[PDB]
Design a protein around this ligand. Structure first.
Ligand SMILES: [Mg+2]
Lengths: 100, 115, 100, 126, 136, 82
RNA sequence: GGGAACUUUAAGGAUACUGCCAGUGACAAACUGGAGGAAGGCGGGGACGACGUCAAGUCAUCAUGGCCCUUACGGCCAGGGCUACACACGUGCUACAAUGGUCGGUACAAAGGGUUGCUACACAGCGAUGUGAUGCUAAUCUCAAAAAGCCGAUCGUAGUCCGGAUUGGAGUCUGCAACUCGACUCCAUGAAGUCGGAAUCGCUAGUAAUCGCGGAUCAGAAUGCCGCGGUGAAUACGUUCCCG
């Protein structure tokens, strides 16, 4: 990966955290049924007014050692190249070659 | 028996026979017959004049052949006139709902025309 | 009427069985009835990893990881038994959860 | 009085055999209610028909896992083992008829690079 | 093989008449591993022929198969005893399917009855094979 | 399409521009990149220059355009035949 | 309430080794036919790939010699494109129907997933789904209806009660946002297609064929890929010709 793309990812991760709480508050208000119509509409507009990077849909998983955006494997947080390399030296606990 | 101007088949069950009219499907036939009080499996050559007339009256309330074709043609021409993307695809006879055209567009394009 | 229920998790069945043996031996030493250890069905997760860097879909490595579990019950425990369990050492690679 | 275990293709049948009058219960249903397929019923009755003791016994059976054919086979295996346990003199004829042996065939695994255990995707030289 | 001889696949006799030939005919009828439908066809047709005439289904089927056994297949090739019965079974299955009785079991029983009577599509095909065979 | 309970979607910056244009008697077009905004009844009679990727294309909003997105009137590809 | 029997769960262990009988082969190698046994002549399957070949693939995972850019070949943003369409080819899915379609009733699995999660139950809707509420960090609660199958009715060889492409209307959900360019639901529409030329592919048994179920990726988005079980065949006389 490029250092620029890695830095982009870091900035987006910071923005999501910065706006996490107000997003939950707004979405809860939008969900409320006791709240009045104009309050719910103001909640909808305040939700639509946040900077785009606050949205978690714009996050992409990357390797963590290299930054590869393909072949992620959540459980390890690594991409396939580095997972193969690290598994075959014994540094991943409980992982062996599989046959059945 | 002429219904909606159409000679619907006479030896089939009513639920099947009504589907020969344009704009009437299985659901619509099952609802028409339920309304007028006739069994779906009753054969069309076993329905008296009043029974036929009741089905005609009910089928009137649903747009069937000429009104339906007219409505469809008007809706398509209005799109081709407004100038939207859908009308532009209708004009060139191309898929309207996002399908690929590099391959497999034969229903819309027709038989393959050599270069 | 308190029955102590210990649940053991691990990625290694030999290590888990050694820890279970240690626990039951201590319980019997201080004097108490024990049910088990009772084996629980194992969890198996499998992974497919491309071995070539660029392009070979059939050239692949298949890995697995297994989680083993055991349930032990100490019935009618003595006052010294509870302290004995806390005094017991901690073994790396084995998670112990004790419920009273 | 006598017990037997039968196994076939992920099916496992528990059979309890006693002296009686030909009663037969599987999972609290009769044979007709449990099996709608007739050859499945024939398979379950093969042993007592070969032995002619069809009304000279009573059968209480439970079955788990598998499908219709596998369950019928497992039940037959269990009945055979129950008969052997009851009267060891009967094992020769049952071995001759083929009901003593356990069938060990099982589904073969799918393999990487193949459509199935053996089937292979279409090859083209170009 | 090129290095060994494979033993013939041994199939068990059927569960209702205990006949290997009946089992093999059932397997020849079956499609896509659906044995139950094949059984309902074959047993149904045998019951139909029995109802029409009071004879043992097994021996009647034996006689019909003997009648529909081809001597050779065109150049004529000498064949082992096992192949003629298989060819008769395939011709019987095809002829019934091409006939027009409502259900497959009934149109199968009809083919069997016609073959026994000596006038039918399968027997005509056998005679045609004989006529193109004996010439060479 | 979009669910009815949420209502239609319009961008705030375009909504304010149309508010100003309708409130006054401005004839100058409204220049926009928001192709995803819906055309509301207040749009009728106005002129909006919608981006297409390389250029802004004029669009004159009629009653029959209401309910469509702005971008349905600005094709993004050029084709003339093989 | 009880029981520890059986099923299963999962650690350890025993077992098969020509082990015995008969004929025969140089008395070599072995080869045939039997009895006990769950299993009898490598028990089935998986991982494991000598020395080497193609200066075969990858500087776009990554590392790295050398050469180039460094007010731009570096960095930030909004819209568009990667989805275009006179055509040609590879790999697949669905059909062309009666061993079938539709409708009513009623059976039998295994392997996986679940707390920014999976959801019993109740209500509302034809429905996608929405609201309330319950259990579960799971051998305990849940995804979950297995489907093909068995019984009954109807359809009677028709481009049809086969097929489900295309198209007009009306909606739901994910998301800041479904125009270009999402999936899914209902009403209407009902295209080609009647078993496919030269030629060519897979498979030797729980296999082929056929039926459904799960997962990684992942807000949403599989007919692909990796797995799981159900039903369950046929044929091999032989190495002359075709390929390595
Ligand atoms: Mg090269």
């Amino acid at each position: 990966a490029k250092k620029g793309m890695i830095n982009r990812e870091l900035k987006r991760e910071k923005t999501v955290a910065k706006y996490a709480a107000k997003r939950a508050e707004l979405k809860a208000t939008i969900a409320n049924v006791n709240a009045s119509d104009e309050e719910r509409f103001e909640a909808m507009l305040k939700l639509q007014a946040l900077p785009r990077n606050a949205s978690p849909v714009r996050l992409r998983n990357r390797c963590g050692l290299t930054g590869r955006p393909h072949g992620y494997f959540r459980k390890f947080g690594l991409s396939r190249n580095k997972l193969r390399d690290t598994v075959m030296q014994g540094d991943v606990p409980g992982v062996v070659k599989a046959s059945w | 028996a002429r219904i909606a101007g159409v000679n619907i088949p006479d030896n089939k069950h009513a639920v099947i026979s009504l589907t020969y009219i344009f704009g009437i499907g299985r659901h619509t036939a099952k609802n028409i017959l339920a309304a007028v009080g006739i069994t779906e499996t009753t054969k069309i050559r076993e329905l008296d004049d009043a029974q036929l007339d009741a089905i005609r009256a009910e089928v009137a309330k649903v747009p069937t052949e000429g009104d339906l074709r007219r409505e469809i043609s008007m809706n398509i021409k209005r799109l081709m006139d407004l100038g939207c993307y859908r009308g532009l695809r209708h004009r060139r006879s191309l898929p309207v709902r996002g399908q690929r055209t590099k391959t497999n567009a034969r229903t819309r394009k027709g038989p393959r025309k050599p270069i | 009427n308190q029955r102590i229920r210990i649940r053991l998790k691990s990625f290694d069945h030999r290590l888990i069985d050694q820890s279970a043996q240690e626990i039951v031996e201590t319980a019997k030493r201080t004097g108490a009835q024990v049910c088990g250890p009772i084996p629980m069905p194992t969890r198996i997760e499998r992974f497919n990893v491309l071995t070539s860097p660029h392009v070979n879909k059939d050239a692949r490595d298949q890995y697995e990881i297994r989680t083993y579990k055991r349930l032990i019950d100490i019935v009618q425990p003595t006052d010294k038994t509870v302290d004995a369990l806390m005094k017991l050492d901690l073994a790396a690679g084995v998670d112990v959860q004790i419920a009273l | 009085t006598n017990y037997g275990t039968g196994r076939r293709k992920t099916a496992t049948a528990r059979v309890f055999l006693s002296a009686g009058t030909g009663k037969l219960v599987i999972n609290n249903r009769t044979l007709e209610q449990y099996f709608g397929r007739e050859t499945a019923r024939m398979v379950v009755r093969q042993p007592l028909e070969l032995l002619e003791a069809t009304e000279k016994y009573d059968l209480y059976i439970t079955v788990k896992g598998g499908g219709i054919g596998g369950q019928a086979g497992a039940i037959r295996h269990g009945i055979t083992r129950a008969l052997i346990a009851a009267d060891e003199t009967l094992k020769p004829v049952l071995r001759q008829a083929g009901f003593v042996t356990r069938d060990a065939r099982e589904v073969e695994r799918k393999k990487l690079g193949l459509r199935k255990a053996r089937k292979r995707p279409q090859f083209s030289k170009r | 093989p090129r290095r060994r001889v494979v033993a013939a696949r041994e199939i068990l006799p059927d569960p209702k008449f205990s006949s290997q030939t009946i089992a093999k005919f059932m397997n020849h009828v079956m499609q896509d591993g659906k044995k139950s439908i094949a059984e309902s066809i074959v047993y149904g047709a045998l019951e139909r022929v029995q109802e029409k005439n009071k004879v043992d289904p097994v021996e009647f089927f034996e006689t019909t198969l003997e009648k529909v056994r081809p001597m050779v297949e065109v150049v004529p090739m000498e064949v082992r005893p096992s192949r003629r019965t298989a060819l008769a079974m395939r011709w019987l299955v095809d002829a019934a399917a091409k006939r027009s009785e409502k259900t497959m079991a009934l149109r199968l029983a009809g083919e069997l009855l016609d073959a026994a009577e000596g006038k039918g599509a399968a027997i005509k095909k056998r005679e045609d094979v004989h006529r193109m065979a004996e010439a060479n | 399409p979009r669910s009815l309970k949420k209502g239609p979607f319009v961008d705030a910056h375009l909504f304010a521009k149309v508010e100003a244009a309708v409130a006054s008697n401005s004839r100058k077009p409204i220049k926009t990149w928001s192709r995803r905004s819906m055309i509301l009844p207040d749009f009728v009679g106005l002129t909006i220059s919608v981006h297409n990727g390389r250029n802004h294309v004029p669009v004159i909003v009629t009653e029959h355009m209401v309910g469509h997105k702005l971008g349905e009137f600005a094709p993004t590809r050029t084709y003339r035949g093989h």
